[PDB]
Amino acid sequence: TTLYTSLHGYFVFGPTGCNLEGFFATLGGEI
């Protein structure tokens, strides 16, 4: 997964807790 809020199955992989700033903002929100 591109993390995609790793809680979603890949729980253990969760790096920056949430990862919204890193991933969902970019790959979703756009900056």
Q: HEC states along 3-27?
A: CCCCCCCCHHHCCCCCCHHHHHHHH
In single-letter form, the type of residue at position 4 comes to Y
CB atoms closer than 10 angstroms to residue 19 = 18
**Domain ranges (residues) in the chain:** 1-31
| Widest CA span in the chain | 28
CA–CA dist 30, 10 (Å, integer):
24
What are the Cα distances from residue 18, in Å, to 24, 28, 29?
A: 9, 14, 15
